[PDB]
Ligand binder design. Sequence first.
Ligand code: CLA
Ligand code: CLA
Lengths: 31, 80, 87, 143, 157, 35, 215, 94
Amino acid sequence: MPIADYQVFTALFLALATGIFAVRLGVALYK
Amino acid sequence: SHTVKIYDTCIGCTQCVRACPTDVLEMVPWDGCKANQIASAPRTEDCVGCKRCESACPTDFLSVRVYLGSETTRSMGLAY
Amino acid sequence: WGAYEEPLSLVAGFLGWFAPSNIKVPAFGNESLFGAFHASMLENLANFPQGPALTDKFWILMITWHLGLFLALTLGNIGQAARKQGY
Amino acid sequence: AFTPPTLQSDTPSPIFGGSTGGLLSQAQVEEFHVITWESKKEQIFEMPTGGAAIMRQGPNLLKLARKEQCLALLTQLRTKFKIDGYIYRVFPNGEVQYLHPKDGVYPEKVNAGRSGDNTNMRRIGQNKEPVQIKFSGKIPAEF
Amino acid sequence: KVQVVQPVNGDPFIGMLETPVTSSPAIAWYLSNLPAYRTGVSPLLRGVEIGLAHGYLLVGPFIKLGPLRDVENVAEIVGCINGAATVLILTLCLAYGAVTFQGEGPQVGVKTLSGRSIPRDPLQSADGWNKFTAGFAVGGLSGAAWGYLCTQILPYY
Amino acid sequence: MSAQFLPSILVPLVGLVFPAVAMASMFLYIEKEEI
Amino acid sequence: RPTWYPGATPPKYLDGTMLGDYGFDPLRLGSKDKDVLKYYREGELTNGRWAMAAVAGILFTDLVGLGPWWEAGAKVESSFDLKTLIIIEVVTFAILEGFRVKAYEKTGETGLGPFAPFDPLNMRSDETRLKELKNGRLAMLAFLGFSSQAAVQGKGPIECLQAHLADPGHNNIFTSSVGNEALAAVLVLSITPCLIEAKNRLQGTDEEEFRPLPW
Amino acid sequence: KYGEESRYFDLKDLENTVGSWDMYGQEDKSRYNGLQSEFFERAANGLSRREYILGLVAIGGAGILAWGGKGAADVRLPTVGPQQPAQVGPRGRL
Ligand code: CLA
Ligand code: CLA
């Protein structure tokens, strides 16, 4: 049962949210 | 802009002053050595860091020390 | 000249107008250096359409003729501007 | 009783044919230096930027980029032609600042009346430990 | 007895020399008539001309050497490639303008070789570079577009 | 693989768009005079 | 002032002078230059007007029983070849857009042809402008939903509504082919305001050195 | 600089003593035709702003993504094309 396209899209969206958290942490570290 | 320092171990031989290629050191009156003169670095802004003054100091250890720090257009010896 | 500062004086035309007078002299073989060069130029295509192939008689003739012409041009210009070699 | 001598703009320059090692664009937006000396005769000397120039008989003025070039030329003049010169720093705005012979007396000679700047009254090994001045933008030699 | 090599503007203490390559009358005229050395012309027009020339001369390389050079549709692919290259050098010009022109300072004046005072080139300004960059985009894209048309036209080719 | 079109879009984005954008932003930031 | 979520703190530059100011701009796209913000508003209004016209047309064709709007492009039969229609549309739109450009460069707003404000009925006011902005935004989301429903579902604006009314619990976006992705969006968005509140509590609202999308 | 003789230094004319010359620049406002100049300045009207000119560059970024998702397949790129058979490997593998 290979992963479907919707699973890849969901993973990419979750990665986008994780990247947003990462950029927030980076901004906090810069300060 | 390097940090140049002179210590009381100096004997006033004036060799470091003659070896400076940018006129950074000079001799001023003193009373801690037989020569009655000490070295000074009033124009450290013109120091390039060649350390020629240290190669001429005969005291052990050296009486003049150069600590390389922030680089400027003059300390880097840039003509452009 | 009209433009530039080129020392190539107008009176110095003798370079290019005298070199042929000597290069046209026959050299026993064939008929003449300039004659052979001109014949090749007019026969092996008018040095523009197709081409002189790879390593042809025209190539060596053109190189030798231009070598002589250029050397005469430059040496004569130097001599004429030097005023009886005053340097 | 010494005062910095003013820089005369009427001083002629040495006979030089020109070179590519002269002033660049830094002198137009940052600064440059000028060395003026007095020669008793017209003689050939070596320039710090490459080539050979001819110093005239009388006052000579030469504009260079770095102060080290002017000092090297002065060293050559002092050790070869026994000529004393003055070095000034010129800014694009037009300000001239006296340099090298600061008090008219060469630095190698004590003048009694100078500033004993940067002269620690301790030994090289009597400086504070690096761990004792941690979290301070200073080196042990500045204490 | 003539000396064709002289110091730049008679000054022998400037890092430059005057040679028949730099001070040649014809060379000086041609170099001075380029769109880059027009202090009195609008930077946008000069940028348009520069972009047109650069965009037109930039198609050829990909046309005759691109990965799809052996295909009939090479002209179109290359036109797009030149457009991309023009856009890239466009962002390069913008970055250079934003970094170079961001502050003001009482700079020294500018004079001609004779000694006639002239104002600084308007191209060396925040707004001057922006206008020049905009003209380069229009001209650069137009030059690449004209490069494709020349391929279709031009009876010889 | 599912969604075969994704690599054809993500590879150029991470190798061409993202690097150009990052380099331009870094170049504009390391020469700001007043950050 | 109502915001894009209860208790939301609008940015410093989003004081409220502009119409439809709900303090929404997480990327800070128009927080640098004011002229760029004005151009952004003009673009938003243009997109909204086009969206309202498109939504009205799509709904009208669906109510009269015409075929799908997305498929209507190939179901039009009349004179004028496709190329001729393209050329005519390009020329007329070029002149119309040029006139609109001049109108924006003069009065700072849109217009129709040489008429800078174009208001024969004189129905221009700050209160009427807010209606246009909000209606345009609603129409933009309506068209986005139309396209999304046409892609996910095989129905139109009316057929999708009928299908939902038939079984609201089983005919929704979370039960379609994009439900999983949708489930991941809501779950994240549902916690987005609260998380922002945390930033406004532990960190505070003392601005930030950078902007998400500088531009 | 007052280089009337051998003096290449002048405080009153320090601008000429630092080699600040245009060398090739020439101010002249009579060249490009008015009708053609108007067309170009009109074409590049609002494209003179940093944000707007960057937008044109952003189009190039979209074209890059468009090529990968469509342009690469239309030029029949080998990576977007098909594959023929395969091999087994050194030993009994795949
Ligand atoms: C200098 C070495 C060199 C050279 C000559 C080439 C040349 C080429 N490469 Mg290549 N490449 C190289 C190094 C080189 N490569 C290296 C080191 C790598 C590995 C990192 C690659 C990886 C690579 C790949 C992956 C590909 C190529 C491809 C190509 C071809 C098309 C590329 C192209 O059109 O670019 C653009 C060319 C220009 C924009 C023109 C710039 C140069 C102009 C002519 C300068 C002219 C200056 C002019 C004379 C100035 C005079 C003043 C004026 C007033 C006259 C082309 C023949 C492509 C191909 O398919 O091969 C067929 C391709 O896919 N290369
Ligand atoms: C650090 C882990 C990691 C690494 C090294 C890679 C590497 C790669 N990925 Mg991948 N990816 C990852 C995580 C990772 N991925 C995760 C967690 C997901 C789930 C969302 C994905 C989803 C994904 C997809 C859908 C695709 C790739 C693809 C690719 C290939 C091309 C890159 C690309 O353009 O896609 C872009 C990658 C993303 C958009 C998501 C990656 C985000 C990661 C987590 C960022 C990590 C940054 C890192 C921790 C910080 C280092 C600093 C650095 C940025 C300077 C490449 C070999 C493409 C491929 O298959 O090529 C054929 C492709 O289409 N990845």
